[PDB]
């Protein structure tokens, strides 16, 4: 009935939109990852660095909280409905992991890239 | 070797500097004529740090003296060591600025500075490795603050990678000896913060207390007060001038004392300060020294560190002593009084040891504390500042010099944020 | 012939070197003028006049230190170009030591080293002396090792280092510099020897029964350890141990290579007269926590590998007996090891330096020890780092020198892994 449709809708608010909330939190997280690169912030006229640190820690906790919630909400959904909970060709929990690893691997890669550049710089100087 | 340029600015600055150079010359065996008559090869060996061996055996302290008007620098030249200085390093105008910061940093100073810097450049050119600059100036002084501030900015412009430090004389919490202090001081700080790498705060008020108490003096003449200050200054750079066990380069001090740019204000201290009437009832041990160094009553800045925490402390020792004594003793301090140190930083103490004692003091030490209690000073200033500012008190003496009122509001903004910063870190915790 | 190149970096590295070479000369009868009024060709080269020239390179961005050497007693023992100096030090800033300052010197250094290496008939390896925390020691060495390993990928890379002791001071930005160095050290060093100044003080107090020690005798103790190691090359023994064998007999897993060190029997003549320092006696002393040169109570972990170096009047069978007893002492060893004892014996007894504070003995034992207990120290270090890094204290000093903020993260990450490694080793492998 309509009530059941609304029930899974509320689940989706805690699940489907819950993922969107995770993604929004995730986006913000990425914004902190970006902002962190601006060395000018060391001149923290307003105590900015302390403020930033608090927020960084907060997000580090939030992303896990939301993921654990979603693990239960997606289970509820798939128990309440046969349709696999996926969108745009990927399961929502896979999507969570996808972006996570996207960032992870990219960050790791970029690090390694620069490591290599340093190794090549070192080589160059030895050749010089 | 590495070289330091000593700039003196304002009546105060020059008077202090005069005493400073007296002290330094004494330590290196340099007489009033600039002739070397030292005993140790060390005195001469690294003399380059300050003096420029002109010719023959005549050494010329590389110092620059600046004032907006004569009658100050003149008296310096008439003094015992006036002739030790090279005439061409006396740069001054023919106009005053009765504690008119605006004049010092604008309508008058803007003219004088055009010279000054040229001399600075020449002096820096004669250096092999320009360590940095030292500025002796007094806050609130039309020259000291006005020109002082100006010069600092101008120098960084051309020497951004050098260490700049100053020994400012700050406002007194008690009776003010100027009327428009708050203004001048605030205006100076507004820019000072964003320039100078580290600066020391010394307050005549505190010095008087020390003299009347610890030194058992009854006639604390400014010359004596300056002498005390000079001693502190010389201690700071002993590591450059002399060999030791743990030499601490001026730059190094900055590194272990400043955790965040902007937060670079320090409270200086010095030991031993025992009065001659009681020197015979002393032991002069590493413990004794630390007792004095961490005694709030021996703070040369008029603040009470007891109400704050130390972000970091530097301790520079001179003469002879064991490494064991020093390290262990400093540890004891942190352990016994851990509540006075900021938990964010493990090991809040930096130490250094030079093997060359002050003349007559087998053991001596200087104390540089980065305490959050300094906030107090700035707080006081801001409060007094707004009290006057909101009444537009005497602003016409600044507005009339082409100063934009907005500059005052900006100055306040910086000041208040400075306070906030200290307040945040004051009680910020690891978890 | 077996040859070895010593490298001394920074205040500590150099100052320690002074003590070392002082000792080397004594043991070989070499007089300050390089004169010898047959085992020298390891540390010394022969010049046209026969004069001995020690094989080492001294590097210190702070010319002061080297100047002490240049004007010291042993100024005649060094080929000028072995004393490489900078103009400005690293101010306890790894980034200066590695990226911005050391960068401009390292080329010279390596060239000098190469020329020295080219005098060799068979280089065994290098002995690098430095301190963690020292901008030069820490920062510069990092760079140095990075490049030495390229030219000499197969030479032994030994180093001695002062490990910022848990409860001491000296510098504030230590844990930063320390970790930053470690992070790179792990990829080039073959074996590092950890020494704590803190621990040594304790030893001076309890074993030597003295008070008020300085680097002038703290280093002397250290030099005894160094001698003990290289004595193997320099003198005939029952069981000579080439430097190469220290890898095999100490490291059991690449990333782990931080042996601790000790040295028995430290003692004043006062007690020497009242005590029979037998082989067994001494051997036991080496395993008494109190006598370790590192502030780490070995009982907290297990032993991975021990190496004993006996000097002087010892008897193989007695040594074996002593060790067997040690094995009995239910001192824990990891299951991964079934032996744990590699022993060298050198006929040349310990000597004694005129004016020293250590009694001469007929026999002595130097012990190197790889133990999981060290993990504690690493944890402490990492913890301190975390606290400072969180707020980003002093970080701007590194970033301003071109260091990448992420680089700190990287280093920390690796350190976490390192600690974990130790944990895994001590798992007590069992089906
Ligand atoms: C450690 C840094 C330091 C902070 C503190 C609290 C330190 C701790 C200790 O000194 C290291 C005190 C010290 O051990 C003493 C008791 C011998 C003593 O010196 O304390 C003071 C009063 C004390 O403040 C109460 C002092 O002013 C002070 O500053 O104390 C009276 C004095 O009369 C002879 C004597 O009784 C600030 O730099
Ligand atoms: N045992 C011993 N330790 C020393 C000596 N000199 C310095 N240290 C220790 O080394 C550390 C400081 O590093 P230093 O070697 O002084 O620094 P540096 O390598 O000269 O680097 P910068 O001065 O920063 O350029 C501290 O832990 C000191 O206690 C010494 O002669 N003997
Ligand atoms: N310690 C010390 N303070 C001084 C000396 N001369 C002036 N002052 C202080 O400096 C401030 C006045 O500034 P001053 O340098 O004379 O003015 P300026 O010439 O315009 O810079 C006041 O706080 C005075 O107490 C001195 O020789 N020693
Ligand atoms: Mg050094």
């Amino acid at each position: 009935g309509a009530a059941a449709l609304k029930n899974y809708y509320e689940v989706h608010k805690e699940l489907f939109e819950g993922v969107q909330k995770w993604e929004e939190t995730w986006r913000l997280f990425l914004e902190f990852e970006r902002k962190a690169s601006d060395p000018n912030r060391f001149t923290n006229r307003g105590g900015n660095l302390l403020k930033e640190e608090k927020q960084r820690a907060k997000l580090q906790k939030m992303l896990p909280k939301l993921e654990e919630e979603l693990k239960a909400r997606i289970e509820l959904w798939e128990q309440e409905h046969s349709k696999a909970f996926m969108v745009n060709g990927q399961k929502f929990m896979e999507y969570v992991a996808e972006q996570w690893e996207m960032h992870r691997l990219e960050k790791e890669r970029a690090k390694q890239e620069r490591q290599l550049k340093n190794k090549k710089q070192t080589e160059t100087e030895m050749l010089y | 070797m590495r070289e330091i340029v000593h700039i003196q600015a304002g009546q105060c600055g020059n008077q202090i500097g005069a005493k400073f150079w007296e002290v330094i010359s004494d330590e290196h065996g340099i007489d009033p004529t600039g002739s070397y008559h030292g005993d140790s090869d060390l005195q001469l060996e690294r003399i380059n740090v300050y003096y420029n061996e002109a010719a023959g055996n005549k050494y010329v302290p590389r110092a620059i003296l600046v004032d907006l008007e004569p009658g100050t620098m003149d008296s310096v030249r008439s003094g015992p060591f006036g002739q030790i200085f090279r005439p061409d390093n006396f740069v001054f105008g023919q106009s005053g600025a009765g504690n008119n910061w605006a004049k010092g940093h604008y309508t008058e100073g803007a003219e004088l500075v055009d010279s000054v810097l040229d001399v600075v450049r020449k002096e820096s050119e004669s250096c092999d490795c320009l360590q940095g600059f030292q500025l002796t100036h007094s806050l609130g002084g039309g020259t000291g603050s006005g020109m002082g501030t100006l010069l600092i900015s101008k120098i960084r412009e051309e020497y951004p990678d050098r260490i700049m430090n100053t020994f400012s004389v700050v406002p007194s919490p008690k009776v003010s000896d100027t009327v428009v202090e708050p203004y001048n001081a605030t205006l100076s700080v507004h820019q000072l913060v964003e320039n100078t790498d580290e600066t020391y705060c010394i307050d005549n008020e505190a010095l008087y207390d020390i003299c009347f108490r610890t030194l058992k003096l009854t006639t604390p003449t400014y010359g004596d007060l300056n002498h005390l200050v000079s001693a502190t200054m010389s201690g700071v750079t002993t590591c450059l001038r002399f060999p030791g066990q743990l030499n601490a380069d001026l730059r190094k001090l900055a590194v272990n004392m400043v955790p965040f740019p902007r937060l670079h204000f320090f409270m200086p201290g010095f030991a031993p300060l025992t009065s001659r009437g009681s020197q015979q009832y002393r032991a002069l041990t590493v413990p004794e020294l630390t007792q004095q160094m961490f005694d709030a009553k021996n703070m040369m800045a008029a603040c009470d560190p007891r109400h704050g925490r130390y972000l970091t402390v530097a301790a520079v020792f001179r003469g002879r002593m064991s490494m064991k004594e020093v390290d262990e003793q400093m540890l004891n301090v942190q352990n016994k009084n851990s509540s006075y140190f900021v938990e964010w930083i493990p090991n809040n103490v930096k130490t250094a040891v030079c093997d060359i004692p002050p003349r007559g003091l087998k053991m001596s030490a200087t104390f540089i504390g980065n305490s959050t209690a300094i906030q107090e000073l700035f707080k006081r200033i801001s409060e007094q500042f707004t009290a006057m500012f909101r009444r537009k008190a005497f602003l016409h003496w600044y507005t009339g010099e082409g100063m934009d009122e907005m500059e005052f509001t900006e100055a306040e903004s910086n000041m208040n944020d400075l306070v906030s910063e200290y307040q945040q870190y004051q009680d910020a915790t690891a978890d | 012939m077996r040859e070895c190149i010593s490298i001394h970096v920074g205040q500590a590295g150099v100052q320690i070197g002074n003590a070392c070479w002082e000792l080397y000369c004594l043991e070989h009868g070499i007089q300050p003028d390089g004169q010898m009024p047959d085992s020298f060709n390891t540390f010394f080269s022969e010049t046209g006049a026969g004069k001995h020239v020690p094989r080492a390179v001294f590097v210190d961005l702070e010319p002061t230190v080297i100047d002490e050497v240049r004007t010291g007693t042993y100024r005649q023992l060094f080929h000028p170009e072995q004393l490489i100096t900078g103009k400005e030090d690293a101010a306890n800033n790894y980034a200066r030591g590695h990226y911005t300052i050391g960068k401009e010197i390292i080329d010279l250094v390596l060239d000098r080293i190469r020329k020295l290496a080219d005098q060799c008939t068979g280089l065994q390896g290098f002995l690098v002396f430095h301190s963690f925390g020292g901008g030069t020691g820490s920062g510069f060495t990092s760079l140095l090792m990075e490049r030495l390993s390229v030219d000499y990928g197969k030479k032994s890379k030994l180093e001695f280092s002062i490990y910022p002791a848990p409860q001491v001071s000296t510098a504030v930005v230590e844990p930063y510099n320390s970790i930053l160095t470690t992070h790179t050290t792990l990829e080039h060093s073959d074996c590092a020897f950890m020494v704590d100044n803190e621990a040594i003080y304790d030893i001076c107090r309890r074993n030597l029964d003295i008070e008020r020690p300085t680097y002038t005798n703290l280093n002397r103790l250290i030099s005894q350890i160094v001698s003990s190691i290289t004595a193997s090359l320099r003198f005939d023994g029952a069981l000579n141990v080439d430097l190469t064998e220290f890898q095999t007999n100490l490291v059991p897993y690449p990333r782990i290579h931080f042996p601790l060190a000790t040295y028995a029997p430290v003692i004043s003549a006062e007690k020497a007269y009242h005590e029979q320092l037998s082989v067994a006696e001494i051997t036991n002393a080496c395993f008494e926590p109190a006598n370790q040169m590192v502030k780490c109570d070995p009982r907290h972990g297990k032993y991975m590998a021990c190496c004993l170096l006996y000097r002087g009047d010892v008897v193989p069978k007695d040594v074996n007996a002593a060790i067997a007893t040690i094995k009995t002492k239910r001192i824990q060893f990891v299951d991964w090891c079934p032996t744990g004892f590699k022993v060298g014996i050198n006929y040349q007894p310990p000597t004694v330096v005129p004016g020293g504070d250590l009694a001469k003995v007929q026999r002595a034992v130097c012990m190197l020890s790889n133990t999981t207990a060290i993990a504690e120290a690493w944890a402490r270090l990492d913890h301190k780092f975390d606290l400072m890094y969180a707020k980003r204290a002093f970080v701007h000093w590194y970033v301003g020198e071109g260091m990448e903020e992420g680089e700190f993260s990287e280093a920390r990450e690796d350190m976490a892994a390192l600690e974990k490694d130790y944990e895994e080793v001590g798992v007590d492998s069992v089906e």
Side-chain angles (χ1 to χ4, degrees), chain B residues 245-249 252 323 327 350-351, chain C residues 9-16 59-62 65 88-94 97 130-139 162-165 168-171 174 177 195-197 200-201 214-216 218-219 222:
Chain B
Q245 297 302 308
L246 296 170
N247 290 73
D249 186 84
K252 185 184 290 185
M323 296 300 100
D327 188 70
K350 197 272 170 291
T351 64
Chain C
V9 179
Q11 178 74 51
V14 172
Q15 189 169 354
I16 291 168
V59 178
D60 191 343
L61 295 174
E62 179 54 11
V65 174
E88 187 180 42
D89 72 21
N92 292 127
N93 186 335
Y94 176 100
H130 67 90
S131 293
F132 287 110
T136 300
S138 182
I162 304 302
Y163 182 88
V168 301
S169 70
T170 302
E174 291 179 11
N177 290 339
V195 178
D196 291 347
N197 283 341
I200 293 169
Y201 289 130
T214 68
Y215 294 142
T216 65
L218 293 168
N219 291 346
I222 292 168

Side-chain angles (χ1 to χ4, degrees), chain A residues 125, chain C residues 9 57-62 83-89 96-113 136 140 143-144 147:
Chain A
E125 292 177 10
Chain C
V9 179
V57 178
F58 294 75
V59 178
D60 191 343
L61 295 174
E62 179 54 11
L83 303 177
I84 298 170
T85 58
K87 293 182 179 178
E88 187 180 42
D89 72 21
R96 286 176 62 84
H98 184 172
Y99 294 113
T100 63
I101 304 301
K103 179 180 176 180
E104 302 300 318
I105 301 300
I106 188 64
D107 289 346
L108 175 60
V109 171
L110 290 173
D111 288 345
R112 180 64 188 176
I113 291 168
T136 300
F140 185 84
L143 175 59
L144 177 61
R147 295 180 68 179

Side-chain angles (χ1 to χ4, degrees), chain B residues 9-13 15-16 67 69 72 97-100 138-145 169-170 172 177-178 181 202 204 207 222-223 225-226 229:
Chain B
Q11 179 183 342
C12 178
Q15 290 166 154
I16 292 169
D67 202 354
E69 61 184 4
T72 58
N99 296 326
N100 188 306
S138 177
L139 294 175
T143 299
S145 294
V169 179
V170 300
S172 297
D177 56 9
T178 69
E181 192 63 14
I202 299 171
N204 286 341
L207 295 178
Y222 270 102
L225 294 174
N226 289 346
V229 171

Side-chain angles (χ1 to χ4, degrees), chain C residues 109-372:
Chain C
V109 171
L110 290 173
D111 288 345
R112 180 64 188 176
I113 291 168
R114 186 175 301 107
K115 288 182 174 181
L116 180 58
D118 289 340
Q119 307 303 310
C120 298
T121 62
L123 180 65
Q124 297 299 305
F126 302 90
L127 303 176
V128 178
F129 295 84
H130 67 90
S131 293
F132 287 110
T136 300
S138 182
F140 185 84
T141 298
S142 178
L143 175 59
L144 177 61
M145 288 300 299
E146 179 69 36
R147 295 180 68 179
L148 288 174
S149 69
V150 174
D151 287 349
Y152 307 101
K154 300 297 183 181
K155 300 299 185 182
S156 176
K157 300 168 191 70
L158 302 178
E159 66 183 304
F160 299 84
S161 180
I162 304 302
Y163 182 88
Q167 300 297 315
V168 301
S169 70
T170 302
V172 175
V173 300
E174 291 179 11
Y176 280 126
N177 290 339
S178 180
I179 289 170
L180 288 168
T181 298
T182 300
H183 179 61
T184 65
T185 298
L186 291 173
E187 301 301 321
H188 300 288
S189 177
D190 292 313
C191 181
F193 300 104
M194 299 294 98
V195 178
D196 291 347
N197 283 341
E198 186 173 350
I200 293 169
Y201 289 130
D202 290 344
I203 292 168
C204 289
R205 182 60 178 164
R206 296 173 298 164
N207 289 346
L208 292 177
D209 296 296
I210 63 170
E211 59 190 46
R212 300 186 181 82
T214 68
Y215 294 142
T216 65
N217 59 316
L218 293 168
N219 291 346
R220 290 183 183 285
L221 179 61
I222 292 168
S223 70
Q224 286 288 311
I225 292 168
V226 172
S227 177
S228 295
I229 293 168
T230 64
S232 176
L233 296 175
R234 293 184 286 115
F235 302 98
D236 290 349
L239 299 171
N240 290 89
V241 180
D242 287 340
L243 293 176
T244 298
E245 293 291 308
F246 284 120
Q247 185 274 330
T248 298
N249 293 326
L250 295 175
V251 176
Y253 182 89
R255 287 170 62 84
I256 298 171
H257 56 270
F258 301 96
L260 306 180
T262 190
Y263 179 94
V266 174
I267 189 167
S268 170
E270 179 181 359
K271 289 179 176 174
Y273 287 119
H274 295 87
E275 184 172 343
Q276 178 64 61
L277 301 176
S278 70
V279 170
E281 181 69 19
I282 293 168
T283 300
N284 287 337
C286 290
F287 288 92
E288 182 177 359
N291 294 323
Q292 305 305 306
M293 300 296 166
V294 175
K295 295 297 288 181
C296 182
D297 183 337
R299 295 177 298 165
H300 294 179
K302 297 191 178 183
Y303 287 86
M304 293 170 65
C306 298
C307 181
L308 304 175
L309 303 175
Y310 290 75
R311 288 179 63 162
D313 185 24
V314 301
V315 179
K317 288 290 188 178
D318 290 344
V319 172
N320 287 341
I323 292 168
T325 298
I326 294 299
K327 290 179 180 177
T328 298
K329 293 183 179 297
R330 68 187 181 278
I331 302 170
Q332 294 289 304
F333 293 82
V334 301
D335 289 344
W336 290 104
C337 179
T339 57
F341 296 89
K342 302 291 184 181
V343 178
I345 297 174
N346 197 290
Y347 293 136
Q348 181 71 38
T351 189
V352 61
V353 178
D357 59 358
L358 177 64
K360 183 177 180 181
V361 300
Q362 298 299 307
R363 62 188 71 86
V365 179
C366 180
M367 177 175 77
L368 303 176
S369 176
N370 186 351
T371 180
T372 66

